[PDB]
């Protein structure tokens, strides 16, 4: 039932805020936490993400963390910034300097217990807490280093709850900072061991979509983040709205993750169409379905045609006949059955929800668990070793007390993870 | 007076259960508040419907039923439905966290904490019985609760209620009818450990029920409500012997007596006819010969398989409505000649026939048209092994890679339980092959 | 487009058909254990029929009829002809035969042996089974069935066959029949004669068995065109009048008999199958059924056309893609 | 084709038409299997909490 949400660092707080902004609009909540909705379908499951305060006020079950105040003020002074519980702001002053070691071991060490206190206070207010969700980037210092420290501490207090993260991978196409492959590799190591489900949101993929597909010549984080919030709303539809699915996070993990370490998901969203003459066409289910599976629509920069899907979850939203959706989804599998492993029968599932996202008559959200995600970890691995071969920029991390061995076993873990994906790409029945 | 207690486990069992009790009430004249004006014995009585309903001093007729689910969503419906006033709160049992489509979680982790409470509520009902003959248990194969908890319950029921009969109504998984990818695991796990603890199991393939709805009822995308109201007709005609004055199958033990020669091969096939659509205004009335015939066409069976390539060990024809014996023998005379009905050489080639003069009831506003006569055929044929072979193959594909296996091991089940269940299924398949082969 | 999988590697005929399918650019082969297939060219034995027709959204068709083995097993054919009322134990085109176990008919066979030996009649019998690729004494045949741990059929040996001249040689006739998913019975216009180069001597196991395995004309095979001219010149008759009417009639009676048992009308998957019928022709131009083959090979010359015919009426009939070498044997 | 065992009642009748002649564990056991599963679970939890303490 209840989910506790944590956003850490600049990126995590940025996309975390847009997420609450978007789903608040869907559930008919205004920026002061009052309900102004029509359908009651919007309150059926409102308690999943919102706490009910005195006076018919719904407040997000959200914890906001950062090692510097800047983004705290930014969120607090924005649209839907007043909706958040004021106790649930936990920030420092030092900042992490895009340094994983500062977030994970030195500066974050002091703030971490304050966060666990708010986490603990929210968990005890839950009827039956099902688990946690974290938004953060892997390329920085706070969301990457301190976000993973939070995951580790939270898992130790709630060892049987589901742990789920929306994790933004770094790309040289978007960001300037040379040490990002270092931060990401240390983070991936923590994620393979302490999360149950991780959505891989690749800034490299988000950039190609905005630049190539959407024709945005000067992409901003606001553009990228509006893709992320749309996808985050889509993948959480079946938690926040009733209908045909009696599903929570654990059931999703059980049916999406056939092997413990292989829990990194490839997300996608339809529709995506550049401005503007095509923005007025009516979307048909056949078109939604082809777009959803198109490699160029994927939100992790990896070619799904290079590998195989272990499992797929697809969710459609809006007014549409389920018969059309059924036929179309079966068409994709029957006509391209070599891209789905045959040792997992009937391994693509569909859910349809009546309420559509704001601004769209229809939409589809894609959750793919594909062996091709290895391309993402290979890319980060290449950048890592090019630098680590010569111990370049290592002093920023050893000056915080870290050893070289810790880097060696992080790259080691990621290389094995790559190997594991490769072995089911060639596994046959 | 011999009573029967129904236990409904998991979403499927509770929703199918809700459909059955609604149908029973329409069939006996019991209203949604528990009163039946046609009952002249207030507070008691030794009538046939009393094997499924107890009576309160106030004149209310309570179902002899128990509802269990490990999460309250589905049972809350029953708690607020048309027939909420007919149940006691003590008959509705809900947890807070479900089995997550995970057998090991339903059987071992969550099951351990709730089994004694369920047994205590069942015990309360058995105490109100003077001649309790056994249990009818409804549950899916694929659910974590339906597979995992039902198994624990069956094992327990043998202990506390040894020698009492246990009958099963089981929903066989079908991708058509929304299936999780691990339902093949749950199905083999629960069949293996329940096999020794039920005396007769009525399997319903969601794929078969789905096609009847689309083909005969003209329903583009059947809902659970469509599936569940059709399943209710079959259950109602199977149990109609226990709830009505009759002579065929008056006691649960007669089901195995009449239908299960071999203990392990206790899965009779159900065929039902006619399924006519209520929208259809014409309503051409079929003869007993026509509907008897339909029982031998594959498209009317509860499991998709081909009985022409198997052997029968028992066959029962259960008619409802406007049916005279003279017509039945005449139909069997014909059916024999124009049909391939091979019995095993150790059993006699014959048919047990029951006739209930009361015709099938329909839920007002359902999808089925009211008919003058209907048949439900129960046959123990080896053709049903086809459903086990399908299921075992899907199991093997995943198990060869140990896919999803860690979810069950992490709940405290040991990996060995998998291959022990699979070997049992291999044996069950050898059993069917031996009973109906000749080369 | 459409998808198919190959599960019998050895099939010379379906090895060919799958090449025509690929040649259309509208079919694709997908491994063996992948279940999202439109067509399954299945294996000879233990074909998992129970797995077909269950994949959502896939019209599945298979190249074998579940149940047609009853017609294609020596032992079961003899039992089917005698027990089925539409064929009768007096069926005038099947040689007298009995099933003998090394249900048994060894007591009934000996009764029909002394009834003939006493009657002073030709009593040459052939004995065979379904595990192999002729005598006048019962004491010599029954001890043979015992030295072989397999069930055998003892069938009356056709003592007075029709012989070809020049050569005074024996032969049999092979007909190819195709049954589609609608149970149309299609007879392939072209047949083959399995000739024996060795002259026939009714008093040596080469001039009696005519199949190509044991062995004038190339490949000991004569085609209908030639055999037709021979009947015209030698006997003043035609192939259609004196032989093909009986062949057409035998083929209908056998397949019409088992249709209620094997028909896939109203089944969740569809079936078709190519059969081989083996016939004998005696001195009086009477045709005898020898055996029915469920997995026949084809004459090397006739692999095309017949295989192209299989895709035309059997496969493309249910999966249409963007003359007639068959004779529709009208039935029902 | 013979008819036998004809029973006639108020709400129907029954009979048999013949065509051709013919030619457990204890409560202890269960609770030991359940407690054993609880053992393996607790052992796994200890391996996780131990690895996290490191
Ligand atoms: C989505 C957030 C983003 O706005 C994305 C880009 C970068 N930054 C901020 C804004 C920005 C951009 N360019 C800037 C130049 C000066 C100051 C600021 C900018 C941005 C753009 O043009 O649209 C707004 C941009 C940036 C780049 C950018 C594209 C881009 O917008 C299209 N490139 C992908 C890289 C780049 O390194 C590259 O690989 O070549 C294409 C690229 O190189 C060249 C020769 O263009 C370039 C351009 C300054 C060079 C050196 C540093 N790298 C980092 C990323 C890259 C840039 C957009 C963050
Ligand atoms: C589905 C498995 C795995 C790859 C395959 C095989 C998928 C199949 C289907 O996916 C929508 C494509 C579909 O059948 C079409 C051909 C009609 C189509 O939509 O293809 C895309 C081009 C796409 O480029 C990426 C293609 O290469 C691709 O992704 O193919 C536009 C256009 O091309 C002509 C065409 O309209 C992706 O999950
Ligand atoms: C493609 C879209 C809609 C659409 C497709 S066909 C139709 C009638 N409408 C949606 C997609 C939404 O998921 C959200 C992400 C889109 C990002 C945009 C905000 C983007 O930054 C911007 C440049 C745009 O593309 C538009 C503002 C033109 C946007 O309205 C169209 C779009 O992509 O939104
Ligand atoms: N016919 C029918 N099948 C159902 C129904 N509900 C679920 N099923 C089927 O049962 C399987 C899922 O089992 P459920 O009963 O939903 O699960 P559960 O017993 O609640 O188990 P958990 O939720 O995992 O604890 C799937 O194959 C569904 O298609 C129903 O009302 N009718
Ligand atoms: N009843 C019979 N009378 C006379 N000759 C017979 C006969 N049955 C079989 N033969 C001869 O034996 C040959 C083999 O026929 P049989 O039915 O045994 O085939 P087979 O299964 O052994 C090999 P194939 O499948 O290639 O025909 C025939 O071609 C014929 O020459
Ligand atoms: C709460 O949200 C979801 C929860 C689940 C699923 C899912 O995808 C449809 C969701 O997101 C829409 C789901 C996913 C994948 C499956 O197989 C890969 C499966 O068998 C099964 C499922 C779900 N069950 C069904 C029948 O779809 C249960 C878990
Ligand atoms: N998609 C997206 N990525 C962001 C955003 N802000 C920062 N990033 C990325 O996050 C990484 C830097 O981490 P950041 O969150 O700034 O650092 P932190 O505050 O120390 O956690 C780089 O790869 C940035 O491109 C944002 O709003 N959206
Ligand atoms: Ca009474
Ligand atoms: Mg920053
Ligand atoms: Mg449930």
Author numbering:
A (entry chain B): 2 to 42, 45 to 360, 369 to 440
B (entry chain A): 1 to 439
C (entry chain F): 1 to 102, 125 to 155, 162 to 231, 235 to 246, 256 to 362, 372 to 381
D (entry chain E): 6 to 28, 44 to 74
From the paper:
Here, we describe a multi-reservoir, high viscosity extruder as a step towards automation of sample delivery at XFELs. After commissioning the device with lysozyme crystals, we collected time-resolved data using crystals of a membrane-bound, light-driven sodium pump. Static data were also collected from the soluble protein tubulin that was soaked with a series of small molecule drugs. In two commissioning beamtimes at the SwissFEL Alvra endstation, we validated the general performance of the multi-reservoir extruder and determined 13 structures overall.
We tested such an approach using the multi-reservoir extruder by collecting data from tubulin crystals incubated with a cocktail of five drugs, each targeting different binding sites, with known binding behaviour. All five drugs included in the mixture could be resolved in their respective binding sites. Additionally, such cocktail approaches facilitate the exploration of allosteric and global effects whereby simultaneous ligand mixing might influence affinity levels at different binding sites as compared to mixing with single compounds.
